[PDB]
Amino acid sequence: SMTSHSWLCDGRLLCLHDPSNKNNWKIFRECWKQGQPVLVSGVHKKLKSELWKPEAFSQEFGDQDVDLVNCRNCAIISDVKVRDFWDGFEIICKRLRSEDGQPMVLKLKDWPPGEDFRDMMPTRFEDLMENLPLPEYTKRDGRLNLASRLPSYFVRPDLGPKMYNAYGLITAEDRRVGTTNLHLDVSDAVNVMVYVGIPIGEGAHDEEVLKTIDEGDADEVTKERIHDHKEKPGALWHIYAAKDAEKIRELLRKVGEEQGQENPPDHDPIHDQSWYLDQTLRKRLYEEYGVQGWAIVQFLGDAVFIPAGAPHQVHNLYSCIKVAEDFVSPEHVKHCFRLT
Ligand SMILES: [Cl-]
Ligand SMILES: [Cl-]
Ligand SMILES: [Cl-]
Ligand SMILES: [Cl-]
Ligand SMILES: [Mn+2]
Numbered sequence: 001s002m003t004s005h006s007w008l009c010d011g012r013l014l015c016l017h018d019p020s021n022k023n024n025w026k027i028f029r030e031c032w033k034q035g036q037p038v039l040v041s042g043v044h045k046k047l048k049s050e051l052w053k054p055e056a057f058s059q060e061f062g063d064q065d066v067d068l069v070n071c072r073n074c075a076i077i078s079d080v081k082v083r084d085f086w087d088g089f090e091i092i093c094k095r096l097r098s099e100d101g102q103p104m105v106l107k108l109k110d111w112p113p114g115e116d117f118r119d120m121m122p123t124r125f126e127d128l129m130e131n132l133p134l135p136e137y138t139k140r141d142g143r144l145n146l147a148s149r150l151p152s153y154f155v156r157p158d159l160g161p162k163m164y165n166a167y168g169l170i171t172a173e174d175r176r177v178g179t180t181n182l183h184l185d186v187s188d189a190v191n192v193m194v195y196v197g198i199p200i201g202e203g204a205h206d207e208e209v210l211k212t213i214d215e216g217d218a219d220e221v222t223k224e225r226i227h228d229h230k231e232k233p234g235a236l237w238h239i240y241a242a243k244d245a246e247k248i249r250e251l252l253r254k255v256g257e258e259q260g261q262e263n264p265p266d267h268d269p270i271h272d273q274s275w276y277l278d279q280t281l282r283k284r285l286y287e288e289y290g291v292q293g294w295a296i297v298q299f300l301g302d303a304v305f306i307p308a309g310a311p312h313q314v315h316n317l318y319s320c321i322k323v324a325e326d327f328v329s330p331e332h333v334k335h336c337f338r339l340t
Contacts, residue, residue, distance in 0.1 A: 008039065009219050009294050016040040019133040019303065028134055033331050035307055037239045037294055043192050044301025046131035051124050052194040052321060058086035061120070064111075070098070071105040071169065071177055082111060089167070089319050092201035103202075107166035107179060115159040128161060128192065128323050133303050138190050138327050146328040147187070155336040157187040157326035164191075168318040170205060175212055178276035179235065180314040182269075184245060186336040187326040191304045196232040197319035209317050212236060215279050216315070217295040225299060234320045237296040238277060242309030242335065245270060247289045255281065270311055277313060298322075308335035 005027055006015045014031045016024050019042050031038055050056065062083030067076055077096065085108045088095035095103035118125045132138040137145055140159075147157055166179045199205070213223065216236045225231050240248060252269035269275055277285065285291045297317075298304055306312055309332065328336060 038305040040133040040303040054089040069107040090197040161325045164322040176278040179316040182313040183273045189306045191324040193234045195321035196234040231299040236315045240293040240311040244291045308332035
């Protein structure tokens with residue numbers, strides 16, 4: 001049966017099933033006020049699928065100059081063509097190689113650059129913005145988005161959306177690496193998975209993905225979306241409540257010291273965006289500091305809602321295209337205020 005919603009993370013995460021249900025706000029706002037993330041499924045069924053393919057981005061924009069990041073060692077690959085990234089998105093035989101002769105796991109940095117998405121891709125802009133869930137919160141002029149209504153005493157988000165494009169992590173060693181390291185944002189955000197590319201050449205890579213989800217602490221209902229419904233999993237997230245951010249900073253200062261980093265007692269390991277919490281570190285956070293988070297698998301067409309102030313990290317299972325929009329809900333406006 002069609003149903004309005006269900007629960008993940010053993011009841012701790014709301015999952016809305018109909019992205020355009022006009023009554024979603026009633027269920028959403030109860031969870032959102034408590035500082036929780038929310039998942040909305042099915043957004044891919046609302047979009048023009050031909051606008052979100054890697055081959056179309058390579059054909060239309062392939063001659064632009066860009067920088068990449070090597071996800072395994074954070075090395076910057078400077079001033080290459082964006083087709084050099086797109087043409088290896090799914091075909092492993094076409095990826096840029098490290099010295100060891102292995103194909104690299106790459107992230108496309110700051111593309112489209114700054115606030116230029118709308119100018120560069122006006123048809124993609126319209127398709128996304130007209131189909132975002134919880135539109136009173138998420139549209140630029142929504143009634144419950146305070147972004148355009150606040151004075152300079154508040155940090156306001158840039159004009160969006162922002163595209164996040166990166167290959168999937170592959171090996172057992174890659175299990176400890178982030179696509180996006182642990183960080184927090186002073187605005188709210190909605191992050192939509194618009195394409196998942198499952199490769200070929202080294203295709204048969206299905207089983208290290210299951211051990212990553214299992215060891216990542218994914219709940220039993222989330223494991224059923226793979227095995228029972230054959231949906232395409234894109235990325236494993238860990239999200240922590242904003243109230244737990246200082247306890248996470250205490251753990252990371254202790255670990256940085258144990259690893260011989262030489263840091264002042266007040267430095268901010270979350271703002272530095274230098275850490276990925278692997279299975280060892282997530283268990284230490286729980287046991288030693290009493291902090292529990294949310295382990296979320298984002299499938300094709302899932303929209304993840306990330307509360308302002310909430311520390312979060314992302315680990316791509318397969319090659320992903322994500323598009324995100326920032327907003328300022330009244331529930332979380334305290335996180336962007338510049339005083340006390
Ligand atoms: Cl809060
Ligand atoms: Cl476009
Ligand atoms: Cl709404
Ligand atoms: Cl990062
Ligand atoms: Mn973020």
